């Protein structure tokens, strides 16, 4: 009778159709990814077109439902997640132009190939050529050449395309009732209608800035230690007061400094904790690793995994007759279908990533009882946070000793713990300043706060200030160095990584509290802890059916994001870095640059 009842019936019908349609699309995607063939591409295109047309039709038929008269929170949330026209709010021509520019930028980033001046015909792509060059090769000249060549042959092409994509997204968000496309992306974390749990889009910026300023002393000490080690490696290329070169950080964008771990290891003589040799001795394979992960997840209290997973999911490389993407992916295909697509080898890294993927699958099946619209994580930073905490728990030395991989005679000392903490820092908090500066630069770009004529000249400012990293060579506005990254060139929110890192640290701290672990936070293991698993599943089953603020409160007791668990995790490492940086300058100088003598 009422419009709310009609909306509920329409949503139920849409969910019933969408379950089957998305199941078919996901099955086609699984077949294509396991076996990349032209027919697989064809059926993938067919399924994608069908799914997109169905979603657009349902969105159009839902937008006519007025959301203000609907008092059911679930129904209103489902409709607003459906009634989102998106870039279609613009005209057909403007939307087509925006999509074409997005595809062009994605192609340029993917097909970005730089040719050395010595041999014009000899060219290398970003992956695996440039990435290997900037992560393994320690030569200053080669890394600088690769970095400059990429940001020139890719940045100059992308700069007009990136600007036009930015303005099109901004006008779409303005027609989508957002101040800018940055606000459009911040609306993902936005919560409304829930007393004591509502979240505003600017609150995301406020929380990110506050958490980054909390990390600022720890990041400054880590940067000081890394710069000191690099001076021990490159005394004539990095100033002790000046910022770090962009190309000398283990990657093009300086995102991850773990590649500098070999150059910044606290104790190089201390052996690294790795039971890969034990796995080889115990003849562990993909099935054994997955079985151990399932046993551990049963120990923490989660239900045993479905056998249909084993029937359908692939664990090893599917031979060579068919080509498959060996990237670790967790597939929630719907209609009771849960799989993992990854070629698992005998190593600690594959162990951790398999545990990450199966934690993703466990989270996905936790909220499977939710309707089709609610069968997703509450925010883009929740599922990956679960995967990361699963990987961390699986990487605990206590768990390795319990399963027999780590022999009991193995000793844990302060130096090994410091090495592990520093490696974790380079992996995790190495990108947090970079993520924050890139996200803030994108926010201002979408808001129009940074004019084009200063774009690069503004970007390298915060690189020198927020990250304390200076570009080795000056870059004009023709350069589009922010677009040199995947997400900027492919229109993906980058704050997801910072949010998921903070969420995973909070969840790990809460799980250690529930499991009542004794000792350092990085040594905390949730093995044989049923209560922690039950508490985690209490909101893993919620998924996105409830506000993510409420879910975070139900885990850590805090309704907002913070880095206090990160401080607890890195406190021994923070003290060690502060002790080491007594003779090395802490901070950076924006004025100094490698290109200025």
């Amino acid at each position: 009778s009422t419009i709310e009842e009609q909306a509920k019936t329409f949503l139920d019908k849409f969910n019933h159709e969408a379950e089957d349609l998305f199941y078919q699309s996901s099955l086609a995607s699984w077949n294509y990814n396991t076996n990349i063939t032209e027919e697989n591409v064809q059926n993938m295109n067919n399924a994608g077109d069908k799914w997109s047309a169905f979603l657009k039709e349902q969105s159009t038929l839902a937008q006519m439902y007025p959301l203000q008269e609907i008092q059911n929170l679930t129904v209103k949330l489902q409709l607003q997640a459906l009634q989102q026209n998106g870039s279609s709010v613009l005209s057909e021509d403007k939307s087509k132009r925006l999509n074409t520019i997005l595809n062009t930028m994605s192609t340029i980033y993917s097909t970005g190939k730089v040719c050395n001046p010595d041999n014009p015909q000899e060219c290398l792509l970003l992956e695996p050529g440039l990435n290997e060059i900037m992560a393994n090769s320690l030569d200053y000249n080669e890394r600088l050449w690769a970095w400059e060549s990429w940001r020139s042959e890719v940045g100059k092409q992308l700069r007009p395309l990136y600007e036009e994509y930015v303005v099109l997204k901004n006008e779409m968000a303005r027609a989508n009732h957002y101040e800018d496309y940055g606000d459009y992306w911040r609306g993902d974390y936005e919560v409304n209608g829930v007393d004591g749990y509502d979240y505003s889009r600017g609150q995301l910026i406020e929380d990110v800035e506050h958490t980054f300023e909390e990390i600022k002393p720890l990041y400054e000490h880590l940067h000081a230690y890394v710069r000191a080690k690099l001076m021990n490696a490159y005394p004539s290329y990095i100033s002790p007061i000046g910022c770090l070169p962009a190309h000398l950080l283990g990657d093009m964008w300086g995102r991850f400094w773990t590649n500098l771990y070999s150059l910044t290891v606290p104790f190089g003589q201390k052996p690294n904790i790795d039971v890969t040799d034990a796995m080889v001795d115990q003849a562990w394979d993909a099935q054994r690793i997955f079985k151990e992960a399932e046993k551990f997840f049963v120990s923490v209290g989660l239900p045993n995994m479905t056998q249909g997973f084993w029937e359908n999911s692939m664990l090893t490389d599917p031979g060579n007759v068919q080509k498959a993407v060996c990237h670790p992916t967790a597939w929630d295909l719907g209609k009771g279908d849960f799989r993992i697509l990854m070629c698992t080898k005998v190593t600690m890294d594959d162990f951790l990533t398999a545990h990450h993927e199966m934690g993703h699958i466990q989270y996905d099946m936790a909220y499977a009882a939710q309707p089709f619209l609610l069968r997703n994580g509450a925010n883009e930073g929740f599922h990956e946070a679960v995967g990361e905490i699963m990987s961390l728990s699986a990487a605990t030395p206590k768990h390795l000793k319990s399963i027999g991989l780590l022999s009991p005679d193995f000793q844990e000392d302060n130096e090994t713990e410091i090495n592990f903490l520093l490696k974790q820092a380079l992996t995790i908090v190495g990108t947090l300043p970079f993520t924050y500066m890139l996200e803030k630069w994108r926010w201002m770009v979408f808001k129009g706060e940074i004019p084009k004529d200063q774009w690069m000249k503004k970007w390298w400012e915060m690189k020198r200030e927020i990250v304390g990293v200076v570009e080795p060579v000056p870059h004009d506005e023709t350069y589009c160095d922010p677009a040199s990254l995947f997400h900027v060139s492919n229109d993906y929110s980058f704050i997801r990584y910072y949010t998921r890192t903070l969420y995973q640290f909070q969840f790990q701290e809460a799980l250690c509290q529930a499991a009542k672990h004794e000792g350092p936070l990085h040594k905390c293991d949730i093995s044989n802890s049923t209560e922690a698993g039950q508490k985690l599943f209490n909101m893993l089953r919620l998924g996105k059916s409830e506000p993510w603020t409420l879910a975070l409160e139900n885990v850590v007791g805090a309704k907002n994001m913070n880095v206090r668990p990160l401080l607890n995790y890195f406190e021994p490492l923070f003290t060690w870095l502060k002790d080491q940086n007594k003779n090395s300058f802490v901070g950076w100088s924006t004025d100094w640059s490698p290109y200025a003598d």
């Binding site: 099955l27 479905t306 056998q307 249909g308 029937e311 359908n312 209609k335 009771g336 279908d337 849960f338």
Partner: protein, 49 residues
């Protein structure tokens, strides 16, 4: 219904048996196993009630 469908989506044949005991005389019952017919010995017996 596909062979690759999920565990909860594979087909399941289900039969529901309602044992109604209305005024009509009882018709269906158990086998009421006929025990071995001993003889010439004191034994309690039951022949059709």
């Amino acid at each position: 219904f596909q062979p690759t469908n999920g565990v909860g989506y594979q087909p399941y044949r289900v039969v529901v048996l309602s044992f109604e005991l209305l005024h009509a005389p009882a018709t269906v019952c158990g086998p009421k196993k006929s025990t071995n017919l001993v003889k010439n010995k004191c034994v309690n017996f039951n022949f059709n009630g």
